[PDB]
Symmetry: D4
Subunit: 163 residues, 8 copies
């Protein structure tokens, strides 16, 4: 069963959040994907967050741009850990998204990743690290994936064009 949900405020956010989904495809981690807006579908948000525990989610990754309320509002309504991905916004280049996600007051946390597609990939990796604490197989695939990333850099030390 899917132990992680990837949600996002808008279809346009998929350009960014697809990179979280890609990590899970690589690591063979079942996941659910859904557009849930704090602003445009507030009642669905509430029912989504209320049922997350009972639906079997152990991590929720939420992405949004601009005044990014989605991740914090999910976190207000569930004990399932929430990771937040700030989507790059046009004018403020995701600074608004970042401040509106990370600056949660005491009592209702959201673990925040980097602005944009690097943070989407990292949210899925952090979610996978969380899951891997109690899933030996996934822990192994993660270790393999990390080693592969390190080996790629190690076997290519010179960035210049071939001799």
């Amino acid at each position: 069963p899917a132990r992680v949900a990837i949600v996002m405020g808008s279809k346009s956010d998929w350009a960014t959040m697809q990179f979280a989904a890609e990590i899970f495809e690589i690591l063979n981690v079942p996941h659910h994907v859904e557009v849930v807006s704090a602003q445009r579908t507030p009642d669905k948000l509430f029912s989504f967050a209320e049922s997350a525990e009972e639906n079997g989610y152990q991590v929720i990754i939420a992405g949004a741009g601009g005044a990014a309320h989605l991740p914090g509002m999910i976190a207000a309504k569930t004990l399932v850990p929430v990771l937040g991905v700030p989507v790059q916004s046009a004018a403020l280049s995701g600074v608004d998204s970042l401040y509106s996600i990370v600056q949660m007051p005491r009592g209702i946390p959201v673990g925040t990743l980097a602005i944009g597609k690097a943070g989407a990939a990292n949210a899925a990796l952090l979610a996978a690290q969380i899951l891997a604490t109690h899933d030996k197989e996934l822990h192994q695939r993660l270790n393999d994936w990390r080693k592969a990333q390190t080996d790629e850099v190690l076997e290519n030390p010179d960035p210049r064009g071939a001799a």
Copy 2:
């Protein structure tokens, strides 16, 4: 009856939001004041915003600091106009509050005022201007209040210490 509600994410916000209440005392505008947190009391927020129309509110002023979700979440759940006051936060000096309130995406507006006590006073004045469109008496008191503010500056053109 009270046609405006002043709400805020925390009791600590009252140091700032009191300045909105002061404007209404001056203009004799009945108002309701309440601590409503998007993060700490999400279900109350929803019921507050859902009932605002039926409770007779025509403007809601919402103040919050940090990742300020309160004003936008109220606006998502009611057609009653929402004005947002960014409370000055410790580290980011209300920049986080300002970006998290003003940068609402298309579809769910929050009219935002200045960071801190000047924005609290201005939110109440803008709310009073909105009400005064259909309240001749209040329009008159506003006009009187404005004239008094202008006259104060006009009768004191020299800022230096007396001769």
Copy 3:
């Protein structure tokens, strides 16, 4: 009659402010549109703001970029509520516009929306919400428009390409 005016500092601002006009076309709200510059036509600004009440305006939406003086100067000269739209500027990406509109001192408010076309659309929606407090028909169309926006997201929960 038109109960809202949309004004802007320059013709170039129309690329942004057109999105406010679009909302009003959708909601069938009569509106006036005009280029009024605080800097290039200061005397027209003064006469525009002075006559707004007598011309029947109940909300003014003002857009400008850079050192954005237009919305605040209108507000200084009329009791008609002013909503400000920060236009995205080249170098500072509308941060200058946002600070120059939102940071009004105590006494002369401007309700500020998001930088750029999302704030233009939201200003018109907030203006329509203000008008809808005393216009049952408009209140209904707004409710319909909101429901349509929510339904669009609800009927499209999966952002991925079709099976």
Copy 4:
């Protein structure tokens, strides 16, 4: 046994990180606390991160200020999930700390919380939420703690001085 470590770049950071420790005292979660500097004790950092899995840690909370390398360098060396707390710095008010923690590139995540003591408390709460996925007792205490926080706001709706 302690399933969470709280580490920080300097003794001076304890003024902030104590607030993470406080959450764990409240929730009765055993924890380890240590000063580990990426810059001043790089070899200890490496051995700390290398042994974290074998020492039984399931979450690491790392706090640092300025050019905050500690959390990301821990994360580079272990699969144990890392939460980062940006400590408020003098000149840049923790903006440097926040950017240096949150903006990790793809491959090595750090879940980041708010600048300063609110983020320290939230990191411990997020760590506790992570642990509570497989610890029914802790899940219960968390639920109790949340309810207590909500009830406090609910039973005190009026922020004004007593009648």
Copy 5:
């Protein structure tokens, strides 16, 4: 006669603008000082700027804080050169003041000085440099003042406590 006017949006700005007045006292340059608010006394602003030429002003120094409209609105209404002093604001530390003064669009300039009391002193010095182009005596006093400032640094090269 006074060839320079020092104006400011509020009496509170005098704490800053006094430093412009001090330069003129030192250089024996007659000057006029007045509180003129774009926001609170818009009609006085217009009449002030309209009459400046006829009143004999050759430079106007305008100081304001927050959404600082005063200098740009003066400049819109007169050909007399306007220098703008951004007053340090509470939350944004004069960044708002600076952006709202300096970012004037093409056609209506305001020469902007540093945030706060250093910019007030510099505005008066720049105004004096402008006047000194056609006033040999003032040019001489300026030269004397500059030499005195240079000599002070030159005769005190070691910043350490006396032997």
Copy 6:
């Protein structure tokens, strides 16, 4: 004779500073144009600033990007008034240029205009306003130019496409 010099740190700055030159062509104001770098030609800078008075300059406009030292270093070496134009830089979008020009300490002023081509045009207009205080003909052309700009906006109040 030329009473204004337009100088700039690099040939690449001409893309921006050309807009100052354009104003002077329009107003028929003789001007000198030169590349002078504080960093790459420090001795020329010194001799340029030292001789400016004797060469007949009454205003100097200096443009530079990045760590923009040119305007302030000219001002340190001459009593001729200096206006500074921050050129838009790649990474920081002229914010670096703006802070490095405007934030001069007490004693050595530089009147600063907007980032980029609007500030270049405005520097020339402010320089022309300075010159026009003692040049009736130029004062007249300026007045004509301003009226033309105002008339353009006035005769085009509707920004929408023709009926």
Copy 7:
């Protein structure tokens, strides 16, 4: 032998760091180039920095983008002077890179250059200046290179198109 190493967090950084290499080609300074990631190859970083002294390096230039840990982590592990080049990042335009490199706490320095390709070129020039203190030939080539840069500006004072 090579007395300078140019290292960078990723192959993608070569687009920027190539400009450091170009300076060394011009000045005929032997150099080593390598991709070394603090995050993706932490153990290689440690062995690289540990052996730098013994490998004959007298300056290390390190470039990285985003949460840029590379330069500071090298500096933590060697006494060889480290110069840091902030690579321009997508969302934050190298501001993150700059803060994460320059804001090192007391005890472990990194001399930081400008964001992007200008800082890469300058790091190599500063490294060459450091080496030239004890290398008369290199000192001479540097002097020649500087003179050539100054002469280029001097022989091209007019930036306008040929007569």
Copy 8:
């Protein structure tokens, strides 16, 4: 003889730059200290930088606040390596100082350290690292100083109050 000079734009900067001097006292490195202002003593700056090589300096540390021109102007006039310390300014908290020092264009480098007293200490340490490349004794004292700093953290792993 003194192989390093510590210079600063003003006596007030000594509060910060004293921390560079302290490092040199600890490491027994002879040094020269002087107030040299780019703005207030431009001719002294030029003669200082011109003679630095002949006076035996191998590193110059320059501190300044605000529009910080000193370090870059020294670097324009000498091949002796220049390290820049941004002094914390009142309004902009040393951000202006940092941008005006670090953002040097290609050709004239300044190695920049952290804002404020930590950067002053680090500039002296980086200068000492540069000198230590050819001074075995100083290299040894540096190594000793580093080890002492590491040992301090290592022997104090628990930041909490004694049992």
